[PDB]
Amino acid sequence: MKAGIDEAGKGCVIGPLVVAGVACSDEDRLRKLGVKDSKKLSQGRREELAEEIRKICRTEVLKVSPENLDERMAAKTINEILKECYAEIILRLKPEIAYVDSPDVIPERLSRELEEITGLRVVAEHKADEKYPLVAAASIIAKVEREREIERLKEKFGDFGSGYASDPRTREVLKEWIASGRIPSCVRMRWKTVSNLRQK
């Protein structure tokens, strides 16, 4: 079987990093589910599609908490962390060939390092989620898992917006949490955004 790998939450300041892999024995059946045009789907429809994917394909998920990300980012960058997560998923699935979505503009270097770590055939590409049904499926699984955690967090800490530095609601909420001296555990402390706000 072939497999697709992707992530959700790499650029967020709140919440986990989720990496997922999907391997199917029947791609045309996967296509029938309509993974190709899943970007238009709502959070509710995405969740439903993820359940259908899980029933006909093997899936593997990995989640890295904000706390654990902060720990690992002391010695590595977010992209290197991703690379490590990608390798773990590929090794669990051990596919014939694995298609991955590339964070940087130059894929070749990622393919090399991955094929070396895994010893398997790997093809990292240009925003591969919209080229290979397998990767798009991986994207759906990762996004749904991330979303469930985000919802759980809002239930506990209130509505902090999307969790991205761009969302105005997120910046505001982050500002007051910092000023309170009591910051929730779901905030990535080693993030550039947080440092700059604490230095303010």
Side-chain angles (χ1 to χ4, degrees):
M1 287 182 249
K2 294 183 182 177
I5 322 290
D6 212 341
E7 60 74 38
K10 64 172 177 176
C12 213
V13 295
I14 289 173
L17 166 66
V18 179
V19 180
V22 180
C24 324
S25 65
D26 187 329
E27 270 201 61
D28 193 60
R29 190 178 184 187
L30 177 64
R31 306 164 191 169
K32 182 185 181 179
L33 291 183
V35 302
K36 183 182 177 184
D37 64 349
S38 49
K39 271 190 169 69
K40 68 174 186 180
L41 298 181
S42 67
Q43 178 174 170
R45 284 301 188 212
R46 274 203 297 283
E47 177 165 42
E48 291 179 348
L49 177 53
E51 289 310 278
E52 294 295 299
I53 298 294
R54 282 186 194 280
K55 291 179 177 181
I56 68 176
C57 308
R58 179 182 171 186
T59 62
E60 289 290 347
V61 178
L62 171 166
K63 297 169 55 179
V64 187
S65 72
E67 170 166 40
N68 286 156
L69 280 171
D70 280 340
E71 201 179 323
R72 298 168 66 170
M73 285 181 71
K76 292 169 185 164
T77 67
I78 190 60
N79 290 356
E80 293 173 319
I81 291 301
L82 248 189
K83 175 191 66 185
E84 280 178 14
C85 287
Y86 283 162
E88 187 177 321
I89 296 293
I90 296 178
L91 289 172
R92 291 187 195 171
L93 293 170
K94 285 196 178 188
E96 161 174 43
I97 175 177
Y99 305 80
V100 188
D101 204 299
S102 184
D104 60 61
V105 288
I106 281 290
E108 18 295 317
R109 177 173 170 171
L110 182 61
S111 300
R112 276 200 286 290
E113 294 169 358
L114 242 29
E115 299 193 68
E116 186 249 68
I117 304 169
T118 67
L120 291 66
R121 180 66 197 177
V122 182
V123 175
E125 292 201 304
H126 165 55
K127 305 297 180 174
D129 62 326
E130 48 194 299
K131 187 180 185 302
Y132 305 85
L134 257 37
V135 181
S139 188
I140 295 154
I141 300 295
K143 287 181 178 176
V144 167
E145 269 301 286
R146 176 176 170 282
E147 249 92 299
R148 304 199 193 181
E149 173 63 8
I150 292 298
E151 216 56 57
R152 191 186 71 70
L153 288 172
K154 291 195 175 183
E155 193 178 311
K156 175 53 175 297
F157 304 109
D159 184 357
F160 46 79
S162 65
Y164 283 81
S166 299
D167 184 345
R169 176 77 279 175
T170 301
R171 297 172 300 180
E172 294 176 58
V173 182
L174 273 175
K175 185 181 179 179
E176 58 175 297
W177 287 342
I178 288 185
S180 80
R182 299 180 61 172
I183 312 176
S185 47
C186 59
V187 175
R188 304 179 183 179
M189 298 308 291
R190 233 143 198 160
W191 218 256
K192 178 190 176 181
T193 303
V194 182
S195 294
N196 295 342
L197 287 184
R198 302 183 75 204
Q199 279 173 50
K200 279 229 272 79

PDB file of all heavy atoms in Angstrom, residues 159-175:
ATOM      1  N   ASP A 159     -13.563  31.024  25.203  1.00  0.00           N
ATOM      2  CA  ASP A 159     -13.290  31.177  23.779  1.00  0.00           C
ATOM      3  C   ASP A 159     -12.079  32.073  23.536  1.00  0.00           C
ATOM      4  O   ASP A 159     -12.156  33.290  23.696  1.00  0.00           O
ATOM      5  CB  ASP A 159     -14.510  31.757  23.061  1.00  0.00           C
ATOM      6  CG  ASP A 159     -14.314  31.839  21.555  1.00  0.00           C
ATOM      7  OD1 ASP A 159     -13.214  31.492  21.071  1.00  0.00           O
ATOM      8  OD2 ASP A 159     -15.264  32.255  20.853  1.00  0.00           O
ATOM      9  N   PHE A 160     -10.964  31.462  23.141  1.00  0.00           N
ATOM     10  CA  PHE A 160      -9.734  32.196  22.865  1.00  0.00           C
ATOM     11  C   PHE A 160      -9.541  32.394  21.360  1.00  0.00           C
ATOM     12  O   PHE A 160      -8.444  32.707  20.903  1.00  0.00           O
ATOM     13  CB  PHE A 160      -8.524  31.441  23.439  1.00  0.00           C
ATOM     14  CG  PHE A 160      -8.531  29.960  23.146  1.00  0.00           C
ATOM     15  CD1 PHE A 160      -8.145  29.480  21.898  1.00  0.00           C
ATOM     16  CD2 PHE A 160      -8.949  29.051  24.114  1.00  0.00           C
ATOM     17  CE1 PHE A 160      -8.172  28.112  21.619  1.00  0.00           C
ATOM     18  CE2 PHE A 160      -8.979  27.676  23.848  1.00  0.00           C
ATOM     19  CZ  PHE A 160      -8.591  27.210  22.596  1.00  0.00           C
ATOM     20  N   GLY A 161     -10.611  32.208  20.593  1.00  0.00           N
ATOM     21  CA  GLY A 161     -10.510  32.366  19.158  1.00  0.00           C
ATOM     22  C   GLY A 161      -9.941  31.130  18.484  1.00  0.00           C
ATOM     23  O   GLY A 161     -10.078  30.020  18.998  1.00  0.00           O
ATOM     24  N   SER A 162      -9.288  31.323  17.344  1.00  0.00           N
ATOM     25  CA  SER A 162      -8.723  30.211  16.584  1.00  0.00           C
ATOM     26  C   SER A 162      -7.473  29.612  17.206  1.00  0.00           C
ATOM     27  O   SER A 162      -7.259  28.404  17.127  1.00  0.00           O
ATOM     28  CB  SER A 162      -8.406  30.647  15.147  1.00  0.00           C
ATOM     29  OG  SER A 162      -7.393  31.640  15.114  1.00  0.00           O
ATOM     30  N   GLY A 163      -6.651  30.455  17.822  1.00  0.00           N
ATOM     31  CA  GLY A 163      -5.425  29.972  18.428  1.00  0.00           C
ATOM     32  C   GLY A 163      -4.225  30.392  17.600  1.00  0.00           C
ATOM     33  O   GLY A 163      -3.090  30.021  17.897  1.00  0.00           O
ATOM     34  N   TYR A 164      -4.484  31.158  16.543  1.00  0.00           N
ATOM     35  CA  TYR A 164      -3.421  31.657  15.676  1.00  0.00           C
ATOM     36  C   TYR A 164      -3.141  33.119  16.003  1.00  0.00           C
ATOM     37  O   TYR A 164      -4.058  33.881  16.313  1.00  0.00           O
ATOM     38  CB  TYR A 164      -3.806  31.514  14.195  1.00  0.00           C
ATOM     39  CG  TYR A 164      -3.678  30.102  13.665  1.00  0.00           C
ATOM     40  CD1 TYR A 164      -4.672  29.148  13.897  1.00  0.00           C
ATOM     41  CD2 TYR A 164      -2.536  29.705  12.969  1.00  0.00           C
ATOM     42  CE1 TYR A 164      -4.525  27.830  13.452  1.00  0.00           C
ATOM     43  CE2 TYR A 164      -2.376  28.401  12.525  1.00  0.00           C
ATOM     44  CZ  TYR A 164      -3.370  27.466  12.768  1.00  0.00           C
ATOM     45  OH  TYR A 164      -3.187  26.166  12.364  1.00  0.00           O
ATOM     46  N   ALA A 165      -1.870  33.503  15.924  1.00  0.00           N
ATOM     47  CA  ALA A 165      -1.448  34.867  16.230  1.00  0.00           C
ATOM     48  C   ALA A 165      -2.192  35.931  15.427  1.00  0.00           C
ATOM     49  O   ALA A 165      -2.275  37.091  15.835  1.00  0.00           O
ATOM     50  CB  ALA A 165       0.049  35.004  16.007  1.00  0.00           C
ATOM     51  N   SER A 166      -2.741  35.536  14.286  1.00  0.00           N
ATOM     52  CA  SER A 166      -3.457  36.468  13.435  1.00  0.00           C
ATOM     53  C   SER A 166      -4.822  36.836  13.998  1.00  0.00           C
ATOM     54  O   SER A 166      -5.210  38.007  13.982  1.00  0.00           O
ATOM     55  CB  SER A 166      -3.602  35.876  12.037  1.00  0.00           C
ATOM     56  OG  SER A 166      -2.324  35.643  11.464  1.00  0.00           O
ATOM     57  N   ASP A 167      -5.548  35.840  14.496  1.00  0.00           N
ATOM     58  CA  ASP A 167      -6.869  36.080  15.062  1.00  0.00           C
ATOM     59  C   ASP A 167      -6.795  37.150  16.159  1.00  0.00           C
ATOM     60  O   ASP A 167      -6.112  36.973  17.171  1.00  0.00           O
ATOM     61  CB  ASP A 167      -7.437  34.770  15.618  1.00  0.00           C
ATOM     62  CG  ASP A 167      -8.852  34.920  16.138  1.00  0.00           C
ATOM     63  OD1 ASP A 167      -9.303  36.068  16.346  1.00  0.00           O
ATOM     64  OD2 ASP A 167      -9.514  33.885  16.348  1.00  0.00           O
ATOM     65  N   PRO A 168      -7.494  38.281  15.963  1.00  0.00           N
ATOM     66  CA  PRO A 168      -7.513  39.390  16.923  1.00  0.00           C
ATOM     67  C   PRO A 168      -7.923  38.925  18.316  1.00  0.00           C
ATOM     68  O   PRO A 168      -7.341  39.337  19.315  1.00  0.00           O
ATOM     69  CB  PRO A 168      -8.536  40.353  16.321  1.00  0.00           C
ATOM     70  CG  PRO A 168      -8.422  40.091  14.852  1.00  0.00           C
ATOM     71  CD  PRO A 168      -8.351  38.584  14.805  1.00  0.00           C
ATOM     72  N   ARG A 169      -8.937  38.069  18.359  1.00  0.00           N
ATOM     73  CA  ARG A 169      -9.445  37.517  19.607  1.00  0.00           C
ATOM     74  C   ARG A 169      -8.333  36.768  20.351  1.00  0.00           C
ATOM     75  O   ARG A 169      -8.233  36.834  21.578  1.00  0.00           O
ATOM     76  CB  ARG A 169     -10.617  36.571  19.304  1.00  0.00           C
ATOM     77  CG  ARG A 169     -11.204  35.835  20.509  1.00  0.00           C
ATOM     78  CD  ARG A 169     -12.111  36.695  21.367  1.00  0.00           C
ATOM     79  NE  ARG A 169     -11.392  37.557  22.307  1.00  0.00           N
ATOM     80  CZ  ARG A 169     -11.975  38.461  23.080  1.00  0.00           C
ATOM     81  NH1 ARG A 169     -13.300  38.622  23.026  1.00  0.00           N
ATOM     82  NH2 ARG A 169     -11.256  39.230  23.886  1.00  0.00           N
ATOM     83  N   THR A 170      -7.495  36.065  19.600  1.00  0.00           N
ATOM     84  CA  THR A 170      -6.399  35.315  20.194  1.00  0.00           C
ATOM     85  C   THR A 170      -5.349  36.237  20.828  1.00  0.00           C
ATOM     86  O   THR A 170      -4.888  35.997  21.938  1.00  0.00           O
ATOM     87  CB  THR A 170      -5.727  34.402  19.134  1.00  0.00           C
ATOM     88  OG1 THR A 170      -6.704  33.500  18.598  1.00  0.00           O
ATOM     89  CG2 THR A 170      -4.606  33.590  19.757  1.00  0.00           C
ATOM     90  N   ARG A 171      -4.987  37.299  20.118  1.00  0.00           N
ATOM     91  CA  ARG A 171      -3.997  38.247  20.610  1.00  0.00           C
ATOM     92  C   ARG A 171      -4.470  38.884  21.896  1.00  0.00           C
ATOM     93  O   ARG A 171      -3.719  38.975  22.859  1.00  0.00           O
ATOM     94  CB  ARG A 171      -3.738  39.316  19.555  1.00  0.00           C
ATOM     95  CG  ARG A 171      -3.150  38.742  18.279  1.00  0.00           C
ATOM     96  CD  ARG A 171      -3.100  39.796  17.186  1.00  0.00           C
ATOM     97  NE  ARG A 171      -4.427  40.315  16.856  1.00  0.00           N
ATOM     98  CZ  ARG A 171      -4.666  41.253  15.938  1.00  0.00           C
ATOM     99  NH1 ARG A 171      -3.668  41.784  15.257  1.00  0.00           N
ATOM    100  NH2 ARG A 171      -5.927  41.657  15.704  1.00  0.00           N
ATOM    101  N   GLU A 172      -5.722  39.327  21.910  1.00  0.00           N
ATOM    102  CA  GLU A 172      -6.279  39.955  23.101  1.00  0.00           C
ATOM    103  C   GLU A 172      -6.246  39.011  24.289  1.00  0.00           C
ATOM    104  O   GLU A 172      -5.703  39.342  25.339  1.00  0.00           O
ATOM    105  CB  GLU A 172      -7.732  40.380  22.870  1.00  0.00           C
ATOM    106  CG  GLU A 172      -7.925  41.485  21.845  1.00  0.00           C
ATOM    107  CD  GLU A 172      -9.399  41.788  21.583  1.00  0.00           C
ATOM    108  OE1 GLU A 172     -10.119  42.126  22.552  1.00  0.00           O
ATOM    109  OE2 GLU A 172      -9.837  41.687  20.413  1.00  0.00           O
ATOM    110  N   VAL A 173      -6.858  37.842  24.122  1.00  0.00           N
ATOM    111  CA  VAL A 173      -6.909  36.857  25.187  1.00  0.00           C
ATOM    112  C   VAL A 173      -5.497  36.542  25.681  1.00  0.00           C
ATOM    113  O   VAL A 173      -5.254  36.524  26.882  1.00  0.00           O
ATOM    114  CB  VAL A 173      -7.616  35.569  24.717  1.00  0.00           C
ATOM    115  CG1 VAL A 173      -7.693  34.578  25.860  1.00  0.00           C
ATOM    116  CG2 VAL A 173      -9.033  35.895  24.208  1.00  0.00           C
ATOM    117  N   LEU A 174      -4.564  36.320  24.759  1.00  0.00           N
ATOM    118  CA  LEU A 174      -3.181  36.031  25.132  1.00  0.00           C
ATOM    119  C   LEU A 174      -2.591  37.147  25.979  1.00  0.00           C
ATOM    120  O   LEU A 174      -1.848  36.901  26.932  1.00  0.00           O
ATOM    121  CB  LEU A 174      -2.306  35.863  23.894  1.00  0.00           C
ATOM    122  CG  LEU A 174      -2.226  34.486  23.247  1.00  0.00           C
ATOM    123  CD1 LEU A 174      -1.400  34.593  21.985  1.00  0.00           C
ATOM    124  CD2 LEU A 174      -1.592  33.487  24.211  1.00  0.00           C
ATOM    125  N   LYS A 175      -2.918  38.379  25.613  1.00  0.00           N
ATOM    126  CA  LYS A 175      -2.421  39.540  26.328  1.00  0.00           C
ATOM    127  C   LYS A 175      -2.886  39.534  27.782  1.00  0.00           C
ATOM    128  O   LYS A 175      -2.080  39.695  28.693  1.00  0.00           O
ATOM    129  CB  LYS A 175      -2.878  40.826  25.631  1.00  0.00           C
ATOM    130  CG  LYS A 175      -2.302  42.091  26.249  1.00  0.00           C
ATOM    131  CD  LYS A 175      -2.796  43.363  25.557  1.00  0.00           C
ATOM    132  CE  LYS A 175      -2.210  44.609  26.231  1.00  0.00           C
ATOM    133  NZ  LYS A 175      -2.627  45.894  25.590  1.00  0.00           N
TER     134      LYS A 175
END
